[PDB]
């Protein structure tokens, strides 16, 4: 007991010493020689209306045109973002959904929430109506995030401090990822879908291996609950948004926090974090009813998106980086270009 | 006009979906949303009987459809999902009176702490909290043998059911820091009482009238 605790403390001290030794420089002082991105002026191009309650999640399609969103009224609406047309409207058994995912193929969608159940709905049914394809159960906490990894299996994170890779065909937990001491609130799958970072309420994020099932890395430095997480487009780094008004960019290779994005004028939490196509801009939704676009390489706030009258709960960027869709608690979605 | 036949038909489908969603929202607007809270086995199951992570119970009483959501067994960070219940019409907070003399720290102390946290948080700054004091018969039975001084050392009253119940209700209501905007409805029940649904009906009727006044630009 005491000896094991001392050994764990020594291992943590060794980790900190190695991180300090490998930190010969900092990203802020390295990217001082590159020109700033200037002022990002994004004007809302599309405004999606039809949700009767606070929108809690959205997910872009791989075609950069379809957009799924979930609301607390019990509705999962799939939009044609180009024409603002409601492609689909799925009534959900539980109205307490706080996450939703869009399959890379587009044939399926996912949702989950306080029901501790991940519902996967088939969009390409021969009957022409979107019926629930699978009902994954086994999580003892609220489903906070879910991300599709191909059609057959899906990665989810729950409020019982655990993540799970489920095989949709069999409905059983293929892999269980445990070790977070707080409720996992966000997920992000790597572009190759071999690793994924999950941030929890323990003020920490964990890089997990899908195939191995073991915790590859652990990242610390946030002062409060991490609500958002997102990989860099390169896949060698990720960004986390937490309850304290600061985003943090960590690098997997360096196992360290590269950058901190914070302003004294912001004292509100962060609900969503996403990157642009090139990763130069980091877009974070805040509780001040506004989104902030920071220069990820220079930590300078490039611009502000101030079209939402309520808390910006969910945010996403298309696969081609053409537009950014932000859904807020005002029951509206806004697509900016 | 700039739209093809398939595009126009898709627009028509979107309009039909809009109409269906508007009808669903109108139907759900008149429903009475209730959030059931408690410190444990205080009587939430007993209240649900006479009226996974989230348990939804829908029942119709006097032409009002109540949807009561029970969050018992969630066992996770409560602060991470209370904001989902911001629009809930009323909160039924159940407290076991007989748990005054029991301990896990006193059980009633934990119940009072939970009541203070729920009532005084930002998401329920104006949501009405109807309070149920279950196991009143057990409380009356064990109040003569177990004085309230164990739970409330400041109780200067006698070992009488009426005085002790009034003191406990006053102590629970004193935790409200927004008495001007939030009203706490206190009711006493023992087992399978048919007046619980009537009391909830009256409380939610008052809440609905106040909300209609607020939504009409009149309050």
């Amino acid at each position, epitope marked *: 007991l005491d000896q094991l605790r001392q050994e764990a403390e020594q291992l943590k001290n060794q980790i900190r010493d190695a991180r300090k030794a490998c930190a010969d420089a900092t990203l802020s002082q390295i990217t001082n020689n590159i020109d700033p991105v200037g002022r990002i002026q994004m004007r809302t191009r599309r405004t999606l209306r039809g949700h009767l309650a606070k929108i809690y999640a959205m997910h872009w399609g791989t075609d950069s045109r379809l957009l799924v969103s979930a609301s607390q009224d019990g509705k999962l609406i799939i939009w044609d973002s180009y*024409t603002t047309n409601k492609v*689909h409207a799925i009534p959900l058994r539980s109205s307490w959904v706080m996450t939703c995912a869009y399959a890379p193929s*587009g044939n399926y969608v996912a949702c989950g929430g306080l029901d501790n159940i991940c519902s996967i709905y088939n969009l390409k049914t*021969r009957e022409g109506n979107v019926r629930v394809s699978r009902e994954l159960a086994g999580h003892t906490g609220y489903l906070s995030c879910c991300r599709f990894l191909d059609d057959n299996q899906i990665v989810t994170s729950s409020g019982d401090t655990t993540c799970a890779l489920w095989d949709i065909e069999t409905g059983q937990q293929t892999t269980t990822f445990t070790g977070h001491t707080g409720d996992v609130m966000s997920l992000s799958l790597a572009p190759d879908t071999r690793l994924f970072v999950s941030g929890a309420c323990d003020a920490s994020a964990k890089l997990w291996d899908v195939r191995e099932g073991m915790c590859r890395q652990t990242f610390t430095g946030h002062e409060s609950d991490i609500n958002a997480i997102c990989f860099f487009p390169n896949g060698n780094a990720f960004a986390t948004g937490s309850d304290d008004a600061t985003c943090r960019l960590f690098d997997l290779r360096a196992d360290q926090e590269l950058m901190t994005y914070s302003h004294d004028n912001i004292i509100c939490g962060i609900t969503s974090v996403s990157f642009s196509k090139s990763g130069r801009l980091l877009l974070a939704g805040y509780d001040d009813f506004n989104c902030n676009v920071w220069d990820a390489l220079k930590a300078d706030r490039a611009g502000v998106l101030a079209g939402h009258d309520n808390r910006v709960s969910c945010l996403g960027v298309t696969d081609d980086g053409m537009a950014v869709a932000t859904g807020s608690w005002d029951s509206f979605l806004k697509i900016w270009n | 006009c700039t739209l093809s036949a398939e595009d126009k038909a898709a627009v028509e*489908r979107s309009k039909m979906i809009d109409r269906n969603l508007r009808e669903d929202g109108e139907k759900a607007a008149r429903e009475v949303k209730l959030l059931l809270l408690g410190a444990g086995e205080s009587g939430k199951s007993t209240i649900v009987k006479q009226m996974t992570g989230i348990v939804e119970t829908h029942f119709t009483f006097k032409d009002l459809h109540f949807k009561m959501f029970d969050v018992g067994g969630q066992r996770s960070e409560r602060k991470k999902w209370i904001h989902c219940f911001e629009g809930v019409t009323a909160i039924i907070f159940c407290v076991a009176l007989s748990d005054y003399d029991l301990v896990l720290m006193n059980r009633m102390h934990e119940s009072m702490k939970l009541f203070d946290s729920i009532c005084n948080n930002k998401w329920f700054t104006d949501t009405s909290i109807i309070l149920f004091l279950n196991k009143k018969d057990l409380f009356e039975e064990k109040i003569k043998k177990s004085p309230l001084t164990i739970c409330y050392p400041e109780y200067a009253g006698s070992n009488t059911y009426e005085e002790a119940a009034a003191y406990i209700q006053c102590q629970f209501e004193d935790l409200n820091k927004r008495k001007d905007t939030k009203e706490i409805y206190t009711h006493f029940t023992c087992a399978t009482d048919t007046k619980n649904v009537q009391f909830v009906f009256d409380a939610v009727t008052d809440v609905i009238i106040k909300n209609n006044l607020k939504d009409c630009g009149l309050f």
Partner: single-chain antibody, 234 residues
Framework: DVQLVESGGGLVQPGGSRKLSCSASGFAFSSFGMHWVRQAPEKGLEWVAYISSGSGTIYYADTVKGRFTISRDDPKNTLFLQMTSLRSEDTAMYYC??????????????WGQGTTLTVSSGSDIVMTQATSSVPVTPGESVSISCRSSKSLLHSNGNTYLYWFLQRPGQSPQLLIYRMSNLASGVPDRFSGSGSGTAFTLTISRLEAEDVGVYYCMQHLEYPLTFGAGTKLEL
């Protein structure tokens, strides 16, 4: 699973009235648009009418407008076509065609069995088939060419061309929708290409299961017109 069973056909004297019915099963009939399509004993180029989901929009062919009427009953999942003052040109087989409309949808995917009705004794875009009978051999590649009076490509980047295959004794089935997309259940042997006006359907490794008449249809304009029908022999 999905089924559209037609009834009400037979022999009708000229000038009479007949109500064809199409009972739907295995799918959500309420959310699906329904077309009535006419296959003449020789031509099969005629599209009768169309009703949208919820009966919001109803369209008729120029030959049948003011004479035929198309209605739907969602609770019983039925499609009705009432025809008054029937003419000798209406002697044909009628099909009720399932057709949903959203982004990425597959309209005209399923066709009904059809009922035979026999009557006793200019601005519309036209689609033309480059050939009528094509002698083919199994295992080879066959190209079916079609032409259009007006470009089928729209300002949204969608070319609204549909390739259907009708087997002998079977209702037409959707092979290609929007000139490039394979319908569900259709083998990958079929491919579609075009440049807005001229289109080609290519079949690789032909078998005996895809021998029949190939029809091309446009959906750019509300009056839906079909091609003459390229028939494959042997």
């Amino acid at each position: 699973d999905v089924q559209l069973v037609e009834s009400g056909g037979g022999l009708v004297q000229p000038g009479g009235s007949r109500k064809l019915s199409c009972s739907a099963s295995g799918f959500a009939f309420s959310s699906f648009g329904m077309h009535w399509v006419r296959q003449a004993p020789e031509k099969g180029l005629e599209w009768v009418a169309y009703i949208s989901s919820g009966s919001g929009t109803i369209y008729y062919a120029d030959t049948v407008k003011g004479r035929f009427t198309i209605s739907r009953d969602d609770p019983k999942n039925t499609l009705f076509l009432q025809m008054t003052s029937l003419r000798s040109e209406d002697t044909a087989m009628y099909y009720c065609v399932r057709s949903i409309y959203y982004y990425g949808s597959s309209p005209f995917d399923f066709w009904g069995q059809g009922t035979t009705l026999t009557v006793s004794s200019g601005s519309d875009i036209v689609m033309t088939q480059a050939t009528s009978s094509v002698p083919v051999t199994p295992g080879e590649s066959v190209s079916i060419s079609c032409r259009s009076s007006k470009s089928l490509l729209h300002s949204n980047g969608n070319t609204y061309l549909y390739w259907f295959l009708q087997r002998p004794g079977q209702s037409p089935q959707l092979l290609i929708y929007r000139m490039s997309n394979l319908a569900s259940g259709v083998p990958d042997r079929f491919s579609g290409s075009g440049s807005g006006t001229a289109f080609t359907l290519t079949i690789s490794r032909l078998e005996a299961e895809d021998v029949g008449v190939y029809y091309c249809m446009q959906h750019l304009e509300y009056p839906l017109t079909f091609g003459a029908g390229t028939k494959l022999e042997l």
